[PDB]
Amino acid sequence: SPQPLEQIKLSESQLSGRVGMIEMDLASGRTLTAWRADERFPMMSTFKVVLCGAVLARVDAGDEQLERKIHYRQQDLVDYSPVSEKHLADGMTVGELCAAAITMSDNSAANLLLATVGGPAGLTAFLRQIGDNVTRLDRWETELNEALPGDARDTTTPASMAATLRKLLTSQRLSARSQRQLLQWMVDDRVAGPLIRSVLPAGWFIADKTGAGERGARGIVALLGPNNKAERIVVIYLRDTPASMAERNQQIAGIGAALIEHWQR
């Protein structure tokens, strides 16, 4: 309702935090709105879309199968792992692990998947391979959410993340089937209610992935658009604020609401 950049300045003032935002045309890749787009922000669980993109790339190459079962142990279990800890005795398929990582931010699921792509270094190598020279994963769950001020580890920039999402979902670097699967996992996101979904008008499409970290870190990456068709990529990150989760969610939602209100203005 304020314009997007007006709302962002209001949010930074109210939060004493730093917001990073990109609004990007999905088809053309053109940047439509930008704010601190070249500053680094902790990815938190938003990295998991890139992770499963790398997994799908391996599936496309015949080096991986979504149906392949992975077995694991107590030593592999870390905080925030509601799904993976339940299947400890039985194991989980690669596809089930991606579903849990993306839709539920399951940490151990993400760690198991990370091992299949060569760990944080392997995932970073994948990013360089697809032309992202900025985004980096350095640590595993749960340390990657530490969000120490000025720490470059496990960060992206709004500009880089937006470009990389577009590459993964539309550039046909992934097979059509893989693009559909990655998008589907994001559509089925279960933990993003308080964010863009809370202000999304009836009849709109949304696919998203969220993140939460220490020191106020919070974020969302999303594809959305009217008439139940994805039209734009929206990336919103927050860092360096002591504000409550409620306040942080409300501000991110408000920035999303501003983008929606001024969609064609």
Partner: protein, 165 residues
């Protein structure tokens, strides 16, 4: 009513039926199937990028099946957390549960998961504890000093820690 809570988690007991669990937890907080197989997963308050929760496992898919597994995240706080990196280093694989608690502090821990694979026998019981330093526990965010200690048949099988001292 309300969402899932530590109080409800404590009231729910091994040996209960699915309906008993749902009645205590509040069915609107709970789900089964899909990602959770034939277990029951009940949401509490929002925490981090998910929710505090409980998950209950059962002896089979049958209606008369009994709770043989209880797991929770951020429903319970340690009573008197005194864990330190020094104490953690004193903990050794092969220790009994009693020995471990004596090492990390008698009020430092909460039970993450407890499973009786041979219920009603205790044979093969697996137990995971989280133990916290003085300011390590958080019910809504991220731990700031926590150790994962896991046991089989009451004997420590492994240990891990984050942020201690």
């Amino acid at each position: 009513a309300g969402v899932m809570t530590g109080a409800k988690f404590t009231q729910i007991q091994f040996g209960m039926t699915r309906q008993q669990v749902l009645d205590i937890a509040g069915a609107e907080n709970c789900e089964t199937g899909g990602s959770f197989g034939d277990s029951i997963h009940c949401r509490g308050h929002a925490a981090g990028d998910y929710y505090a929760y409980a998950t209950f496992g059962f002896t089979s898919a049958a209606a008369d099946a009994k709770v043989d597994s209880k797991s929770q995240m951020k429903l319970l706080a340690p009573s008197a957390p005194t864990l330190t990196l020094a104490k953690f280093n004193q903990v050794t694989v092969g220790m009994t549960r009693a020995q471990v608690l004596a090492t990390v502090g008698q009020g430092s821990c909460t039970t993450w998961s407890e499973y009786y694979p041979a219920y009603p026998s205790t044979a093969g019981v697996t137990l995971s504890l989280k133990c916290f330093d003085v300011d390590g526990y958080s019910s809504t965010g991220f731990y700031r000093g926590m150790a994962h200690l896991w046991f089989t048949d009451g004997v420590l099988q492994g240990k891990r820690q984050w942020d201690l001292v």
